[PDB]
Amino acid sequence: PTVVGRIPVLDVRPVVQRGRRPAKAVTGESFEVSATVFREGHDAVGANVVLRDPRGRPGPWTPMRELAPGTDRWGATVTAGETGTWSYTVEAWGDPVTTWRHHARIKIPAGLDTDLVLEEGARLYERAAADVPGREDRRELLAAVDALRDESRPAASRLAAALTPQVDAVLARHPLRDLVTSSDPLPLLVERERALYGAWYEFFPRSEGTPHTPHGTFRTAARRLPAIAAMGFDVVYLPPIHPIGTTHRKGRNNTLSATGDDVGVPWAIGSPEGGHDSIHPALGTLDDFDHFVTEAGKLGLEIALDFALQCSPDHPWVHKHPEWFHHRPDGTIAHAENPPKKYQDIYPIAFDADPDGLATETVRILRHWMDHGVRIFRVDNPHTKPVAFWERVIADINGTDPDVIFLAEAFTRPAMMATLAQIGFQQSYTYFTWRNTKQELTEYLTELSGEAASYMRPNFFANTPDILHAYLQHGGRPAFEVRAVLAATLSPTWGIYSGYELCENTPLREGSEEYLDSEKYQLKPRDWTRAAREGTTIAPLVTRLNTIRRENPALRQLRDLHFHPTDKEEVIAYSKRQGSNTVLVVVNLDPRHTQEATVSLDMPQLGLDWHESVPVRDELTGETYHWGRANYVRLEPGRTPAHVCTVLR
């Protein structure tokens, strides 16, 4: 057996890990399958994609086209259906009819061998006719065969009868394919919509309490849910809900020693009261949690729980499984670190003495929470545990429960970030927060919407408890408005951490990305009512963004994205499409100064001619414009951060 087939079909993409891990999609998502296809000699080739579902059934006729002239790179768009493990193959073949046609068009006017040429075409068309199941379509091709062979008619007339639109239409649907050659199948893991698309809201239940009982419970924290669903979110991400240790507990503002009433950091998991399978007694009981989850569901909210594989010094594991920790020679366990950040309040796990015990327990924990309706886990700092540990765990859980979604909070280097997604994390946190210029934003989203989309699905949290960017610190409310538009229009999954709406932007100190008086170390009650009546919240903008996303398929996908040029460095423009839905966005990245610019649209990239002028609606205001090749915009910070326009049908 040779490595190349009769008709070379090489380097099929997408490919992950040389085919050892699957490429990714979700239900209804489209993406481009490509390959390098060519043949010996000078005759024409064709190619098509054969997409096979989990039961092995082939999809529709999906012909490919060469993507640029002389490159021999071919592509076609395919669309995932139901969830599960799919496969894709590229078939390449000689296209003798295209070849003949080319030669005929030249030879026949030139009077060169007209009878031999026309007979050769007749025999090609007959072979094509012998495969066509339709009787009418067969009749049509035999009628052309007859015409081609009618030696009483003029050459150019005979030929023209084989080149009619209705002959072309038959041949486009049922082409004569010589020497069909296939690649080896590549795998596609198709998952549920939410893996790609969803809006996320993070908050700490404990901060939503009362004057009598400041430490909120699941019963009191439930009252925040309706407001969260009303802002248009689909997922509520909770920090750790377990008991919190006392030894080395952190006080307010990341101070080393807690005082008597300090609540500590939820990520310092575990005490004599319980570990990762338990509920912090101040939040209530498992039954209260079930109530929280039921009420979330009725509002169309799924819960994502935080999963942090680490322990406070008081976690039961410390004495029950000492070999899950690395001990120094005096028996002590060094506290966890991410230099120059220190986590004095927790111990890191050691994985190499009892990897089987750790796997078994981890998945029991996850299954416990799964039995209570948590189908989405936000995994804390996954890059500080072994990659192969996550690979085995996710495989074990998705083996019985494929719907479960894991989000990797890996703010680390590219290689680890990529690899974590490739070994099975459905979603990933990203570098979004550190992309604020037009050049940074354009470069990064080109990367994320390109080849990386075959393995990574990004979750653009405009802020987190650990990340308050200088852009927001220095920008104020207009900056919060911009970042919200960007996140919500550039990724089909975005998120905010509670307080973002209120434009909280006081840092711990100059040049830090920590908040001052961070909610990680203290209860942080918020006057939601006042903010709403005094209009000091960007909650209405947030709500509108999620509505626009729910109303526009283009914003619920990642891969179709194009950046259109402008004459201003502060002003950025882009478009996204899904079927006939097209969304066009123009953002002023300057939060302090009004910017006026000219936006030059790539009209073909919108599916229009250059001279066309088509109507749009700015969905933020309801206002209408007529836009084309070049357009003046004027964006005043505070009044408008951006135009988020749909192209009107």
Ligand X SMILES: OC[C@H]1O[C@@H]2O[C@H]3[C@H](O)[C@@H](O)[C@@H](O[C@H]4[C@H](O)[C@@H](O)[C@@H](O[C@H]5[C@H](O)[C@@H](O)[C@@H](O[C@H]6[C@H](O)[C@@H](O)[C@@H](O[C@H]7[C@H](O)[C@@H](O)[C@@H](O[C@H]1[C@H](O)[C@H]2O)O[C@@H]7CO)O[C@@H]6CO)O[C@@H]5CO)O[C@@H]4CO)O[C@@H]3CO
Ligand Y SMILES: OC[C@H]1O[C@H](O[C@H]2[C@H](O)[C@@H](O)[C@@H](O)O[C@@H]2CO)[C@H](O)[C@@H](O)[C@@H]1O
Residues that bind ligand Y (CB under 6 A): 250, 254, 265, 267-268, 308, 343, 345-346, 380-381, 409, 465-466, 520
Looking at beta carbons only, is 53 or 119 nearer to its own copies? 119
Contact, 206 vs 520, CB < 8 A? Answer: no
Backbone angles phi, psi at 457, to 5 degrees: -120, 115
Least gap, CB of 196 to its own copies (angstroms): 23
Contact, 47 vs 64, CB < 8 A? Answer: yes
The mark string for 388-427 relative to its own copies (x by CB under 8 A, - otherwise) is: x--xx--------------------xxxx--x---x----
- Angle subtended at Cα 504 by Cα 443 and Cα 546, rounded to the nearest 5 degrees: 60
Q: Please give the full DSSP string across 91-143, using - where no structure is assigned.
A: EEEE-HHHHHHHHHHHHTTTTSSHHHHHHHHHHHHHHHHTT---HHHHHHHHH
Q: Is 648 in the site for its own copies (CB under 8 A)?
A: no
Tell me which stretch binds its own copies (CB under 8 A): 60-68, 113-121, 368-376, 442-450.
Answer: 113-121
Least gap, CB of 254 to ligand Y (angstroms): 5
Q: Which does 516 bind (CB under 5 to 8 A by kind): ligand Y, its own copies, ligand X, none?
A: none
Tokens for 540, please give them. 């209405």
Q: Please give the full DSSP string across 236-295, using - where no structure is assigned.
A: EEEP--S-B--TT--BGGGBSS--TT----TTSB-BTTBSTTS--GGG--HHHHHHHHHH
Residue in this structure with the two tokens 């039995």, named with its chain if needed? 371
Q: Is 112 in the site for its own copies (CB under 8 A)?
A: no
Number of neighbours of residue 516 by Cβ within 10 angstroms: 13
Q: Which does 352 bind (CB under 5 to 8 A by kind): ligand X, its own copies, ligand Y, none?
A: its own copies
Looking at beta carbons only, is 168 or 443 nearer to ligand X? 443
444 is in an annotated binding site: no
Q: Is 41 in the site for its own copies (CB under 8 A)?
A: yes
Contact, 428 vs 458, CB < 8 A? Answer: yes
Let me know if 91 is a catalytic residue: no
The mark string for 45-74 relative to its own copies (x by CB under 8 A, - otherwise) is: -------------------------xxx--
Active-site choice (191, 208, 380, 519): 380
Tokens for 107, please give them. 């030879």
Give the residue closest to ligand X by C-beta: 70
Rama region for 36: left / alpha / beta (φ>0; ψ in -120 to 50; rest) = beta
Q: Please give the full DSSP string across 375-404, using - where no structure is assigned.
A: -EEEESSGGGS-HHHHHHHHHHHHHH-TT-
Position 584: which residue type? L
Question: Quick one: which of 232, 348, 591, 641 contacts its own copies (CB under 8 A)?
Answer: 348
Q: Which does 477 bind (CB under 5 to 8 A by kind): its own copies, ligand Y, ligand X, none?
A: none
520 is in an annotated binding site: yes
The neighbouring-strand residues paired with 464 are: 467
Least gap, CB of 334 to its own copies (angstroms): 9
Following CA atoms 34, 36, 40, 45 in sequence, which dihedral angle do they give, to the nearest 10 degrees? 20
345 is in an annotated binding site: yes
Least gap, CB of 237 to ligand Y (angstroms): 11
Rama region for 525: left / alpha / beta (φ>0; ψ in -120 to 50; rest) = beta
Tokens for 319, please give them. 């004495």
342 is in an annotated binding site: no
Looking at beta carbons only, is 175 or 205 nearer to ligand Y? 205
Looking at beta carbons only, is 303 or 571 nearer to ligand Y? 303
Looking at beta carbons only, is 26 or 417 nearer to ligand X? 417
Q: Which does 385 bind (CB under 5 to 8 A by kind): its own copies, ligand X, ligand Y, none?
A: its own copies
The alpha-helical segments, DSSP class H, found in 310-354 are 317-320
CA 168 to chain centre: 39
Least gap, CB of 433 to ligand X (angstroms): 8
Give the end-to-end CA distance of the chain in Å, rounded to a whole number: 54
Tokens for 243, please give them. 């008991």
The neighbouring-strand residues paired with 78 are: 31
Let me know if 519 is a catalytic residue: no
Active-site choice (234, 314, 361, 409): 409
Count, residues in the chain: 649
Q: Which does 621 bind (CB under 5 to 8 A by kind): ligand X, ligand Y, its own copies, none?
A: none
Taking the CA atoms of 408, 412, 416 and 422 in sequence, report the sign of the dihedral they define: positive
Q: Is 110 in the site for its own copies (CB under 8 A)?
A: no
Interaction with its own copies in 142-201: which residues (CB under 8 A)? 179
Question: Would you tell me which residues interact with ligand X (CB under 6 A)?
Answer: 69-71, 411-414, 431, 434
Least gap, CB of 465 to ligand Y (angstroms): 6
Least gap, CB of 475 to ligand X (angstroms): 15
Looking at beta carbons only, is 237 or 455 nearer to ligand Y? 237
**Element of type H or E holding 363:** helix 355-371
Least gap, CB of 415 to ligand X (angstroms): 9
Q: Please give the full DSSP string across 451-469, using - where no structure is assigned.
A: GGGGT--EEEES-BTTB--
Least gap, CB of 40 to ligand X (angstroms): 14
Tokens for 642, please give them. 């951006």
Tell me which stretch binds its own copies (CB under 8 A): 129-137, 190-198, 255-263, 330-338.
Answer: 330-338
Contact, 585 vs 488, CB < 8 A? Answer: no
Tell me which stretch binds its own copies (CB under 8 A): 13-21, 54-62, 258-266, 617-625.
Answer: 13-21
Residues annotated in a binding site: 250, 310, 345, 381, 520-521
Residues annotated in a binding site for alpha-maltose 1-phosphate: 250, 310, 345, 381, 520-521
Residues forming the site for its own copies (CB under 8 A): 2-6, 8, 10, 15, 17-21, 36, 38-42, 70-72, 116, 119-120, 123, 179, 328-330, 332, 337-339, 348, 352, 383-388, 391-392, 413-416, 419, 423
Active-site positions? 380, 409
